[PDB]
Each structure stands twice: as structure tokens, then as C-alpha cells.
Design a protein around this nucleic acid. Sequence first.
RNA 1: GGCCAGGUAGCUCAGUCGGUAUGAGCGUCCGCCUGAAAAGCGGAAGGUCGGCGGUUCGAUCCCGCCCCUGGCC
Lengths: 49, 834, 49
Amino acid sequence: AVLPKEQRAEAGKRVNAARNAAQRSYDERLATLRAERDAAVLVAEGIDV
Amino acid sequence: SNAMRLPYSWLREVVAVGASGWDVTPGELEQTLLRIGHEVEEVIPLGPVDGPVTVGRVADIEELTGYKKPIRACAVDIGDRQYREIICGATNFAVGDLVVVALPGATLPGGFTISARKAYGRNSDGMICSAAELNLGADHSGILVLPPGAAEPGADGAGVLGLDDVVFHLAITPDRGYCMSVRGLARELACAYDLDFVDPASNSRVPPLPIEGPAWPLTVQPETGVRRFALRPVIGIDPAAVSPWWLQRRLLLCGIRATCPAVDVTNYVMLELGHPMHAHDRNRISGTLGVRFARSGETAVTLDGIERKLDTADVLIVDDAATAAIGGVMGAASTEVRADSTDVLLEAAIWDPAAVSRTQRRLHLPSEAARRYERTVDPAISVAALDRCARLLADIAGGEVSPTLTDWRGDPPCDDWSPPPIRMGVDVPDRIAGVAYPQGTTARRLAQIGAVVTHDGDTLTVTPPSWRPDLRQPADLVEEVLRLEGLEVIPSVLPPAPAGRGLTAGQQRRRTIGRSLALSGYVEILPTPFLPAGVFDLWGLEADDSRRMTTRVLNPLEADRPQLATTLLPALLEALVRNVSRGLVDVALFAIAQVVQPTEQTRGVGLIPVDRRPTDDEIAMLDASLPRQPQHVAAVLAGLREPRGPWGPGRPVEAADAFEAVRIIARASRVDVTLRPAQYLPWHPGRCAQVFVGESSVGHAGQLHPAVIERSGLPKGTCAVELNLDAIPCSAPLPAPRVSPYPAVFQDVSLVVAADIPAQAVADAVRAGAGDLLEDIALFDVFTGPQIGEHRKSLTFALRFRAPDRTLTEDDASAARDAAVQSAAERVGAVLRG
Amino acid sequence: NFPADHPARGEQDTFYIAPEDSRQLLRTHTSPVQIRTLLARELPVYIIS
RNA sequence: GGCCAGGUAGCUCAGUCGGUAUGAGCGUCCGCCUGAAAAGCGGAAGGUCGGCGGUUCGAUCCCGCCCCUGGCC
Ligand SMILES: [Mg+2]
Ligand SMILES: [Mg+2]
Ligand SMILES: [Mg+2]
Ligand SMILES: [Mg+2]
């Protein structure tokens, strides 16, 4: 926002590419960790019903 | 809709023709209308005003510039030698117009006192009033302009406006289409007050105009259901003429805006007599007028300028060039009366009520004409209403009535619109009412409403009038007599009901289940049958899960919630979130309702004739066409199950509390259940039990899956239960306990098993081996210490042995215990603790 | 005794079951339960629903 | 059916017509504190700004369609 108007297009494009790379890694890691939780829920928290 | 609005003054005038001097208070009129069956939605008195409210004439206008909005400094003639200077922000008037002036000292509704003001650098000596400021009508955009000749300057405003009037807003039931007019309502009041009625549609009140030849060539396809179609011209009307104030005022108080004399007259006569009327510019008609069904893909532009997609069941009026009207719904723009129209062809038609209903609902056009035609219009008054229109239009617009008339009345022509006669015993209304009416009551009341009545001994032959097509059966005639005599005369006596069987076992069980859950701390809710959007996606159910096979509503109140519930849990979870989100975090809810579980695609059954009873096969077919709808009981829990207090911090909800809910329901149903580990969304796969009665599955209980909890925004640890009550058979046990007077023997037994062995399986094996000497068994210890071994557990049961006919020795009890130990070794692999 | 294509039945706005013209709906009153009882039970009938 | 006005945190609501909602009151959490609490003082977390697309380097904000309430037929 504080950057000059002439520089916002170039810099903003590099920020979004880095931001999307981090967001991409987070999304799949969240899915991986959720899948592991769902796979381990039956045994780790089982009870005698 | 069913709304009928009319001013009392007009209703009184029509009643007073046959009952000179008739006049009742609005409170009594409202009660009389209610007593005979007409719902009064609102009674709206006009005004009131007080002080100097007078008619004025705008004699000059000075435009005041330099302000936000255009402002006018007006010199207004109020009938004396000193014109008043009045400031007004409205722009809908010109020099020479008649207006209504409230002078300083006047009081307008409500409590608005008028005084001289200093506005826009000028001195305003009063105000020019709008219809809304006078409580005459709703118009507030501009001020009220009276038509030329309505009064002279200086005339009393309240008198010219008739502000002592009262407007009645009625809701007419769909069996009384004849009451959507002053004619019908006045006739009803004449019946209620035993007055002589002069029919405003009769030849004495509307003397027939000459009939010297046809008015316009016409072809009618009788398959359209049109019963009558009449035409008469009025030539040489004055384009500059405007309807007189008495006519524009009555239209306004009935909710209709005045536009021009030709249209105003057709609307006025429609309100007066109940027969819709339409004015065509005859000079814009090209060739023969034809009444026919619309063809596929045909369209027409109605006089509102909107193009209408037509159906082959829509009835039209057409000429050689274009469509002239959607019959009984709205006229077309092609023949519409315009400001320069000078020759008019008036249309008085009777359309098929069902055809109009279908057409107007498809096109969303519930016009004043359509809602009358769909409730049936009296076909006998078509030419009367036509002649009434023609004579009134010619008078107020300076025209001439043409002595020509076209009047199609069917092939062959119908010269008598009498419905079929009805035979009824003279005492039938007395029997149904339980009242012995005075002699001749039934015949007098039925003649009052317009029927022809003849006596054949004890049997009446009743021919209803043409405006009462709702009178078809003796029961219809009974209602007429009873409502006019007043339902208050009907006594109150209890019927002779037979000895009943009371509540069924299922109805009784539902009460007992609800009492037990409530006493155990559960709060009942009423579950909504519409599923939250995408709830099964939140649960992660498979695409082929039977709960996804839902019945869907075509027109739900929320377009994203059309499906009906196959399970009660979504509605319970939604109520749990409502409670928790508002600060009530420790909650236990339950519900008892039906679910909707279809077994096929939505399949309908054709209409079965209602003149007979449906056969048992037709009944079973109607039942088989419906989705299965069994009764369920369900519950949800979150937060603390036991509250904190001076005993301690309380106890959070756990899966065992859901299992206990199952046992509460089971004890209330007097059935034995078993619980077995299961996997079944949305439950936690390690904390889920499937519930069985015998070998039949009846539901599930336990803790909800943590992923479902996260995606659904539920409290952590939320637990749930759902059982199918229809799958639980109604039981009626008859116990015969035999209390043994001999002492018992107490022993405990400790057995080591694999961790996956259910404790109930160990108890079952112990019971099977111990035999009949075992009176009671109770688990009181589950030990997984280090001396036991990994993936194993020690269980200790308290055993109570008692013989029915002797005292036992310790060896006798130990022998039964040892057989229970061997039973457990064989069935669950148990090892005696050591 | 509801007439077809009439305000006595058209005004009665009803939750109809999809698709259109399926002749299946959510009941607008418990009166159909009374109709079912008259078909199944011998007269006289004194029934609450 | 109209051009509008509205959907924003767990609740009730402010506020932004492009790159931080420096959001409020209450709700949740931490510290001091208390035997344990709460208030008080000092601090944090939490919204993907109604849904789906589009424009754009980038949209709570601009455009389209749709869902749900209000002004009102
Ligand atoms: Mg009747
Ligand atoms: Mg909110
Ligand atoms: Mg604190
Ligand atoms: Mg704080």
C-alpha cells in the first residue's frame, strides 16, 4: 500500500507467487495431517462400548 | 387475493333504495357482516379534520428559485375577496386547479394543528393538502387536485371530500364471488336486516338500451368455455372530458386510481354490479373479433406493455391484425383506450372460471377482473352491466350510445341462466342445526337469497339464482338458512360417543420415553423436517449412503434446504449449536418425530374418482407410493453432563452417557437391548455402539467423529444417539417372581481377557456357566496395570448366589463359580486371575 | 372436496414434493388422517388426530 | 416483478467503493490475584466480511448470476 503506484504491479506479483507457494504447502499438509488423524482415531481412542 | 374494499356511503345508498332511511353505525355493520359470514379485516374512518378546511382554486403560481427543490408561492382563491398566499412544494398542479386548503387554526389527522409559517423567505397562510394528509387516500407524492366542477372555492372541504365516510376492508371467501361488489354485499345486508332489496342490475334500475342490429362481427369457438359475450358502442366521446368527482372518489375509496372516463366507468360498474367490463378503442380494431384458444408459442402484449407467453389453454380475443385481450385477465395494448380515443366498443363477457384461474396464475396477473371471473360472474347481467356502462360513459364524456348490440349466448342461445333445481326436506336445516326453527323459516330465507321455492308436501324444490353457483346440494342450502338465522341460536349438547379403547401401546410408549428422558435431564425440542444445506457432506457420508436418498420439496421457504430429513440428528445438532452459541454450553436435547425415507423416485398416483370409496387395492397403492416414515427417538449432548456444585467440579459428557440414554429408552420401552462396537458415521469409530433388540438393529449411540465435529462447528466431545422406535416391538411382559427365603452367598471372580473382549461378553459367559443359582452379577473393577500384560485387562465381578429351596455351602457356590470360569475360558478366552 | 383450478385449492399454498405434478405433498392439515380412519374403521367414528 | 437498502467475530452490531476489519460491547484464553473463583489491572486468540464465478499482479470493497431478511406491491 505504501509503495509507489508504479511499483505495486511488479512487487505485488512477486508477493502473491510466494504467498501462494506457502498457502499451497499448508493446504496439503493440513489434509495429510487430517488424514492421519482420521486413520488413527479408531485405535487411539477406542473404548469398550 | 380475496380483498373487497368499499365505502359505507355507497353500500348504504344501494341498500337504501329498497329501505329508505336505512343507516347503521360502523360497529353494528361490522358485527352484522361477521355474523352472516363476511370477515371484516379493517374498518377505516376517513379524516377527521376540524377548523377551516376549504376548497380553493390556484389563481397564480410564482416559482421560488435558489433552493434544494422547486418551491411554489401560490395565490389561492378561497371564495372571498382576499386571495391567500400559500407555499407548496408539490408540482402536480397548475393555475386554475381546484385544491383543498387547510388554513391557520385547522386540525388535520392526527393532531396536526395548522398555523401561519415563515418558509422559504415567504409567509405561508396555510397549506395545500395531499390525500394522505387528509386521510382520504394514500397519495403523498403530490397534493390533491379535484376535477373541474367538483365544487366552488369556499366549499367546505370535509363535505366535498366526504370525510365522514368509513371504508370497509373485507376478505371474501371463494364460495361467495357475488359478494365482490356493492350489489352482492347490499343484498346480503337486506337479507340480514329483513329488508326489501332493489337490485342495482335489474331492468328497473338499468333500463335496456335499443337493440337495432349487430354492433361488431364476432366469431366464438364454444370449446373455450365462454358462456356469454356482448358488445355495444359509444361514439363521439370527448377526449378532454374527465370523470366527475363523485365517481373518481368512489374508485379511490375502493382502491382503484382514476385514469379516463371510459376506463373509470368500466371499473365503477365492475365494483357496482360485480361484472368486469372492458373498453376497446373501436377505431383500432381490424376486422372480425374472434374468441379462440391461443396456439403453441403464441404471445401477446397486454395493455401494461409487457409481452406474455401464452398457453394453448389460454382463451384470447383477437381481430384480423393482432390479439385484443387475454380473455378475463387483461386487455391488450393494440385496442387499449388512449387519450385521443373517440369511439369505444364496450366488452361484457363471461369466461370459464377454471380457464381464467389457470391463466392468471401462470402469468401472475391477479387482476380485478380475473379474481372475479375465477369465482364465477353472474351471466344474467352481462347486457345490464353493458348498458349501464354505455349510458354512463355517454353522459359523462359527451358521447352517444349506438343502438346496436351483439350478444352471443351460446349455440343454441341460452335465454335462461337458472341452475338445476334442488329438492330438500323442509325440516333438513332444523335437523342439522338442532334447532326447531319457526314455521316457514327455511322457505323465507331461501327466497331472500334469490331462489325460487315451491312446496311439494314436505319437500321443497329450490332453484338458486344465477349469481349463486355455489348452491348445488341441500347442505349448501342449509348453510344459507343457518347463517341468516344466526349460529348463536344453535344449542350446546354433547354427542353420544361410544366407549373408547384409550391410548394405543405405541402412543403410551412415546409418553413414557419422553417422561424418562426429561427426568434424566434431557430437554425436548421440536425438530425441523428440512435438512441443513450440505449436512451429509459435513458428515462425510458416502455418495451411496441411504440417508442421502431424500424426498425433496419443490417450493421450500429456503431454496438451499429442500430435502426432508432421513435422520433427526441434523435438527438436534442445529438446536444444540443455537444453545451453546448463546451461552448455554452444558446441554442435553432429545426429540421424537418421524423421518422421511423414500425407497424409489417420487412417483404419483392418478386421480381416483371421488364419487365412490377407493377400493382396498387403490388404498394400498396410494400407501405404497409414499416414502417410508417411521418414528425415531434421538438425543445429543455436550458440555458438562453433571453440573458443578458443593460436591465437586461436575463431570463432562462422555460416550457412556449416550449409551445410558439408550438404556433409559430401553427400560422405558420394557425391552432388552445389546450394544456392539460398530463403525458408522457421523459417530467416532472407536466410541460407537450399534444397538440391537434381539438380532434386529435399531440404531446407534456414542461420541461423534472429531472430524465431523470440526467441520460442523460442534462442541468437542459432542455425543449423540438415534433409535428407530418402529423397529422396537411393543412388549407386554408378565413377570412371576418367586422370592427365595433362603440366604445368599457372595463371591467375587477376577478374569483376565484380551483388551478387545467386551465386558458384557464376559458377563454373559459367566452367567451361562454359573446356571440358575446365579441371582446377580455386577462388574465393579477393570484393571490394566503392569502385572496384567499388554493388550489385556482384568475384570472383577461381584456374584450373588441363592438357591430357591435350600441354604448353600461355600462349595456349592464355588462349584457354580468354577463352571462360570470354564464357560468364560471357552467363550472369550478368559484366564482366572493369578 | 377441494375443487381443482379454483381459489378454494389454488389459494391453499402447499409444500409440493418434487418434481412438479407429482400429486405428493406435505400435508396442510391432519384431515387426511381423518379420511384414512373413515376408510379403515367401522362406523361410528370419534377420532382425534 | 422494480431500482434500492441489508447478510461482517461465539452473541448483538459499527466500519471500509483494491494490498492492516490498527473493529466495539459482551463470549473464549493467559498473567498478577484467590485455598479455588470473579471483579480489577495487564495482555492474547478467533472472521477465510452470504454462495459461485469474473475483472485485476492482488477483491469484504468493482461486474454477473444465485441464496437469505428489510423498505414495500
Ligand atoms: Mg355455502
Ligand atoms: Mg451474527
Ligand atoms: Mg481471568
Ligand atoms: Mg481481560
